[PDB]
Write a protein that binds this ligand. Structure first.
Ligand SMILES: Cc1cc2nc3c(=O)[nH]c(=O)nc-3n(C[C@H](O)[C@H](O)[C@H](O)COP(=O)(O)OP(=O)(O)OC[C@H]3O[C@@H](n4cnc5c(N)ncnc54)[C@H](O)[C@@H]3O)c2cc1C
Ligand SMILES: Cc1cc2nc3c(=O)[nH]c(=O)nc-3n(C[C@H](O)[C@H](O)[C@H](O)COP(=O)(O)OP(=O)(O)OC[C@H]3O[C@@H](n4cnc5c(N)ncnc54)[C@H](O)[C@@H]3O)c2cc1C
Ligand SMILES: N[C@@H](Cc1c[nH]c2c(Cl)cccc12)C(=O)O
Ligand SMILES: N[C@@H](Cc1c[nH]c2c(Cl)cccc12)C(=O)O
Ligand SMILES: [Cl-]
Ligand SMILES: [Cl-]
Lengths: 517, 517
């Protein structure tokens, strides 16, 4: 079979430029890559929060160290997501926050520390789970950097940045390596009688042909949805939000610092993200138009930040779900053309490079063996549905009952069998997936992470933070007092490390300034 | 002169039965009215959107309160038309909607609030015009009823209903009051040598005579066009659409509510109406066969609602324009036999009862003084051409340039001097027609409304919603800072009222259910 020689990518957003740069890197020889992007159709870039695999799977693959790309996209550090007002009727007099941290909880004699923490809590211990089981949250409260001043990493972390600058950075990188860039707009897609894409007709009269087409056209799914008519599986029975009102807000970094984390602030009918960088934070009230008008959401959002009627707003809508198949015939959808999940756990750009990684793992020749795309499609389904369930798990486990939106989340969602099973194991007191690896190994072993994306620590951070605890601690632990004592020593180590970080890390603001102002 | 004694109405659609019932009411004494309608020729009833004058001019005249006719026609409430994707290249990621609301914008020291809104916008104010100047659009976004639960009206509104049931309701009403109903089909019309209608010959052998004939035969204009040969002024140089593909679509009212408004969803080569009622919405893609085939339009329409090849479709065509004269000799055309304009602003049934109102205002004796019909004809010309221009104003002011259809609308339409003049005044920053009345008074003073049908607020809703703003705010306002401050207080009142409506109105779905399931 003849190899894929010509590849056309439609779209110049994060997805398109990730596709171009990843493919130019992966396909060392025999690949002519052309990216077409409209000057008249905006890209989506709201100020984006990311996860550690962005470096390990994407930028390492390209050979670009963090210190190289990060200042060029005005990047800032993210060590967690902090959830605010998710636990109860929010009360202005009560500190209701919890973190979802990156990295693994240690095990003690084959049992995660989360489980020894729960046993302690049963005996009256008051410290919240993540403060007991992770060394860094206090440091995040102090707004400290994830690294010592000399760059030595001290916690697992990822990044906040404007996705426009990332696309820009990658456009530059990809074009210097031979990606052909066409600024133009596809207006028509011709399919042959078998349903394979033949060519694209552009507004300026170009006809584009390729062996393989990558649809990075964004939510419109120009190729996959509009031309190939792949059904989009609407998942608004799983997740209620379908909208956002977003903006960027100046930050007084010198008086207030830069939070080394994304915040998710629960609202009446959704939640608001906060994504700090130097000088500004991006923020969006993600909402369900079924429970609040865009009008009321906008008022709620402005009021949250003390913003004025003169404040500019980005009024976004989205459909939650994914294509029935990401790759149909000679077209692979990547990015918003493939799926969307609300940014509650920073998985959007993850879906782009994880899908690109999978595409190269299932790379076709010009015969397009359906066994390859079928395998690829099943990986994407698992990747997305798994994240959808984890995100959904933040909603149906809420104890908030103070609005129709929160009541509908408690009562009216459709739950996969897979999520119910996990919730059942959790409530029984069983660990979810645990690894013996350290973080370095986990984040270096993408075939493992991709299939074991949400571990025990991730579920515990969310479920325990939300106030849903297991019915009881692990029965095994009643037979293991020595193991319980060793766990105490591990809790004491973690506390030592927290205290060392407190006095050793530079502020996130100072460290960011030091790298590049 | 002998009075009109015998009146024959040809046609049993909305127009015929409105004519019968209006005339039986108006002509208290000396009137024998006969309506002939074919059992073999369908009526036009697609699910119809209406305006507040339907109650005030038509049903009040008959003495039928809203609460009486409305459940009998399975009516639902309409508080606006919402225009979707009319502003730009539609983008699935962007909320592009605006409302055209019923009712007046308040004035502040002789200047409409629209003008104070524009000055604010010049200074960076971001709220869309209709959300600033009207209290109800947020409530429509929340799908709320126009009335409190006890029926107290809270906004100006009209109705959605199947026009078949209205005809049915009025048939019953008119026959109980002495209208003679003949189910039969006119096959021939005899004119005397002077060109006056002598009699109608029916398929079943009846000969019908009358002093006055009302042509409600629909688009075929059996009497006015076919028998009297009155020229129809084709207006396809003004407006491009000549076709519709229509259907009814089930609605999940319990999960999705019932939108208290008509939607107009701009397509590639026209627009699609949505007209919600209980259990279903009527919908039609109105299109120009010059830019899209009926085939492609049908595919576009099915795709819009995720409908299947098994979905039933009503494939409509129409000619846009009006008779040179509505009333010729002893024949008055009323309804589709008289004129057609696409349903972009819900004027079809309006044309029926406004024309009937005018007919009674110009009512003849058997001498048929041409001065009466000449006056009547000039009123109809003004009524129709005025609406034609307002509808046309939605098209030529578009910023959409993404298809041939939208480009032709931007560049290729014939514009009346009257519409150019208005657009010129608008762009200069001048108010169009303003009233000092409240809505109640406007909607109660039909001689005023009929001549001042589209006010400043109506033009602003459309022009501002479409993104065509005046070159600058009213120069007068630079001399009136106190007036500007008073306008602020009025903007604050409107916001208070919006917020009160949000928490006080029942959902439109709940209120409709409560009245009659
Ligand atoms: C509200 C919101 C919040 C988000 N938050 C996060 C977050 O915190 N973290 C994270 O990782 N991700 C987040 N995401 C996801 C992320 O922003 C996007 O997935 C990502 O930035 C790339 O989107 P895309 O490239 O698939 O599509 P787009 O950005 O929509 O780019 C589309 C491209 O296709 C081109 N195009 C479209 N049609 C044509 C055509 N006809 N001819 C030629 N070109 C065409 C456009 O010009 C553009 O270049 C968020 C997304 C949304 C909507
Ligand atoms: C696509 C479309 C969308 C519309 N949307 C709206 C809307 O949203 N809001 C609104 O207010 N209006 C709307 N209208 C207009 C409205 O539907 C019609 O004007 C109205 O319902 C009445 O039409 P009519 O009675 O004049 O003619 P028809 O409904 O066509 O009725 C014709 C009658 O004449 C009879 N007839 C014809 N020839 C003979 C004959 N030879 N002998 C005996 N009887 C005969 C027929 O049997 C029938 O009874 C719309 C119209 C169309 C076409
Ligand atoms: N395997 C993923 C899990 C994850 C996705 N988003 C996260 C966030 Cl936002 C915080 C903590 C962990 C995650 C990771 O550790 O990066
Ligand atoms: N004088 C008319 C103007 C009008 C016709 N159609 C409309 C619609 Cl569909 C919305 C708002 C106003 C109108 C009215 O207010 O009813
Ligand atoms: Cl995301
Ligand atoms: Cl109409």
């Amino acid at each position: 079979n003849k190899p894929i020689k010509n590849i056309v990518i439609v779209g110049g957003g994060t997805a398109g430029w990730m596709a171009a740069s990843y493919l130019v890197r992966a396909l060392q020889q025999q690949a002519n890559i052309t990216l077409i992007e409209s000057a008249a159709i905006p890209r989506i870039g709201v100020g984006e929060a990311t996860i550690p695999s962005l470096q390990k799977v994407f930028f390492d693959f390209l050979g670009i160290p963090e210190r190289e790309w990060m200042p060029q996209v005005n990047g800032a550090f993210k060590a967690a997501i902090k959830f605010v007002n998710w636990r109860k009727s929010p009360d202005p007099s009560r500190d209701d926050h919890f973190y979802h941290l990156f990295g693994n909880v240690p095990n003690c004699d084959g049992v995660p520390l989360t489980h020894y923490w729960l046993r302690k809590r049963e005996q009256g211990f008051q410290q919240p789970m993540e403060y007991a089981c992770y060394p860094q949250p206090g440091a995040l409260d102090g707004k400290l950097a994830p690294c010592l001043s000399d760059g030595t990493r001290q916690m697992s972390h990822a990044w906040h940045f404007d996705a426009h600058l990332v696309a820009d950075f990658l456009k530059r990188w990809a074009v210097e390596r031979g990606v052909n860039r066409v600024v133009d707009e596809v207006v028509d897609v011709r399919l042959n009688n078998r349903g394979y894409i033949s060519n694209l007709l552009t507004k300026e009269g170009r006809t584009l042909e390729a062996d393989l087409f990558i649809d990075c056209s964004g939510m419109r799914g120009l190729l996959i949805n509009q031309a190939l008519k792949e059904p989009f599986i609407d998942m608004s029975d799983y997740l209620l939000c379908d909208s956002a009102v977003a903006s960027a807000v100046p930050n007084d970094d010198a008086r207030d610092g830069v939070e080394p984390y994304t915040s998710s602030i629960a609202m009446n009918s959704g939640w608001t993200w906060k994504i700090p960088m130097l000088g500004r934070f991006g923020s969006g009230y993600v909402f369900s138009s079924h429970f609040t008008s865009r009008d009321q959401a906008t008022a709620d959002f402005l009021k949250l930040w003390g913003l004025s009627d003169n404040q500019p707003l980005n009024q976004i809508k989205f459909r939650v779900g994914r294509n029935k198949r990401a790759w149909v015939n000679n077209c692979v959808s990547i990015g918003l053309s493939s799926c969307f999940l609300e940014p509650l756990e920073s998985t959007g750009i993850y879906f782009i490079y994880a899908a690109l990684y999978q595409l190269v793992k299932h790379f076709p020749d010009t015969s397009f063996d359906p066994r390859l795309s079928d395998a690829f499609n099943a990986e994407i389904v698992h990747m997305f549905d798994d994240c959808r369930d984890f995100v959904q798990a933040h909603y149906f486990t809420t104890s908030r009952d103070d609005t129709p939106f929160w009541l509908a989340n408690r009562h009216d969602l459709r739950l996969s069998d897979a999520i119910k099973e996990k919730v059942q194991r959790y409530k029984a007191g069983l660990p979810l997936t645990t690894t013996s690896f350290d973080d370095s190994t986990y984040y270096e072993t993408f075939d493992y992470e991709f299939k074991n994306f949400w571990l025990n620590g991730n579920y515990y951070c969310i479920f325990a933070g939300l106030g849903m605890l297991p019915d009881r601690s692990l029965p095994l632990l009643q037979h293991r007092p020595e193991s319980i004592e060793k766990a105490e020593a591990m809790f004491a180590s973690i506390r030592r490390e927290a205290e060392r970080l407190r006095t050793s890390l530079p502020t996130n603001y100072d460290y960011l300034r030091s790298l590049r102002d």
